[PDB]
């Protein structure tokens, strides 16, 4: 009952933590971004690799905390801060500044949230023109080995929702991810070697198991 597929896979986890400012002199530090896949979380990756094909919905919750920068200026009286969390489907426009037009496109779903309230949450369906996702692909992208374009799942972007000339602030977002209504096909053996990077199956050769003293050795009984 605890070994069913749902109870084994449907569990929440922190998969990305990022920081972003209201004012800066880099302009890439003004927003945070994440590409959705399940290959940079080493514990979820291994449980997912026991199968060849998967199908699930996604649920994402966001925990967001702010701070005034230790730069100099005190005595402030500020209202609570507002944030915008945008999801981009596969085949959507990507922003490059925080002032871009794509933060207003009608087909990118978006959430507006102010601090002090309950943590925000959105639910994404199975988004693929194929019939399942694949954890393993023995092919070419059209050319990269092992990468097929049916596994695109979208992106998430987060910014502040101030007006003009805002006050300096630093925020941190943590994303909690959970698959739901899961189905799996074609079981596989468990990964025996350590993972080396996030896109390949590359590995250094590993021992089959650890040694004992002799082929007869059994430890003394208590």
């Amino acid at each position: 009952s605890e070994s069913s597929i749902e109870n084994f896979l449907c569990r929440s986890a922190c998969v990305y933590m990022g920081e972003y400012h209201t004012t800066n002199t880099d302009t890439s530090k003004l927003f945070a971004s994440w590409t959705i896949n399940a290959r940079r979380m080493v514990q979820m990756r291994r449980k997912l690799e026991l199968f060849t094909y998967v199908r699930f919905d996604m649920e994402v919750t966001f925990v967001i905390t702010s701070k005034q920068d230790q730069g100099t200026q005190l005595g402030q009286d500020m209202p609570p801060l507002t944030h915008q969390i945008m999801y981009i489907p596969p085949g959507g426009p990507i922003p490059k500044s925080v002032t871009d037009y794509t933060w207003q496109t009608s087909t990118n779903p978006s959430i507006f949230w102010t601090e002090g309230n309950a943590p925000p949450r959105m639910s994404i369906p199975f988004i693929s023109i194929g019939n399942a996702y694949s954890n393993f692909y023995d092919g070419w992208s059209h050319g990269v080995y092992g990468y097929n374009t049916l596994n695109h799942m979208g992106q998430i972007y987060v910014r502040h929702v101030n007006g003009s000339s805002p006050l300096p602030m630093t925020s941190t977002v943590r994303m909690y991810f959970k698959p739901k209504h899961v189905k799996v096909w074609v079981p596989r053996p468990p990964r025996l070697c350590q993972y080396k990077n996030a896109s390949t199956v590359n590995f250094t050769p590993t021992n089959i198991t650890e040694k004992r003293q002799s082929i007869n050795y059994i430890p003394e009984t208590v």
Partner: protein, 222 residues
């Protein structure tokens, strides 16, 4: 309207909660499912499959195919031990990285019965006898061929059968307090002229239908 009263626990984020969530893409009809062969409902379907045991896990051969081969030597040694181990899946090095061992290491409590199969990989001209013996948990491992005969055992003639099967009934987890299995030369191997002298045995392990697991946890291997 409708007088209402908030209880403790309101506006908290509980990592294991189960609530309905708003969809971010409501106007999107999903790809229907395909009937892919090889669907899985439960992890115990993976543990009920046989896998090869690395019984020869001694020094100098932890990275070769030789780790899987029990050596049967030539000549007359008709009371010596062939092999022996404690039956401890999950904890013991010889069972730890099999398909059954890898599953059990996701759970903090498990119990059931286990199936061991032995197969003789010699030439069709070789004959001889082995004695396969089982000691329960809390008993010492036999020291001679005669006291192994005085317990639970089977006499296996490889000129008649190429394989033997054992089912072990009382398996749980936590100088072990576990049962053990040993193998002894009853006669020695006899061949005609022109056949190879040495040979090998192989072990397969699996779980029987009554296997249960509890308290999903994190695995200690990645």
């Amino acid at each position: 309207g409708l007088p209402v009263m908030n209880t403790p626990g309101s506006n908290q984020f509980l990592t294991s909660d189960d609530f309905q969530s708003p969809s971010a893409m409501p106007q999107f009809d999903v790809t229907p499912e395909l009937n892919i062969p090889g669907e899985v409902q439960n992890l115990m379907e993976i543990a009920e499959v046989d896998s090869v045991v690395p019984v020869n896990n001694v020094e100098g051969k932890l990275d070769t195919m030789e780790i899987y081969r029990i050596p049967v030597q030539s000549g007359n040694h008709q009371s010596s031990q062939v092999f022996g181990f404690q039956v401890q899946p999950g904890l013991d090095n010889v069972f730890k990285h099999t398909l059954l061992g890898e599953i059990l290491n996701y759970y903090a409590h498990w119990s059931g019965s286990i199936k061991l199969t032995f197969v003789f990989c010699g030439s069709a001209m070789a004959t001889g006898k082995f004695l396969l013996a089982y000691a329960p948990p809390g008993a010492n491992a036999p020291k001679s061929r005669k006291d192994a005969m005085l317990g639970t055992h089977i006499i296996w003639d490889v000129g008649l059968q190429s394989s033997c099967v054992l089912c072990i009934p009382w398996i749980s987890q936590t100088y072990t307090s576990a049962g053990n299995v040993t193998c002894w030369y009853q006669t020695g191997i006899v061949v005609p002229a022109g056949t190879p002298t040495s040979c090998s045995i192989m072990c397969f392990v699996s779980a029987c239908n009554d296997f249960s697991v509890r308290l999903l946890k994190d695995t200690p291997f990645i």
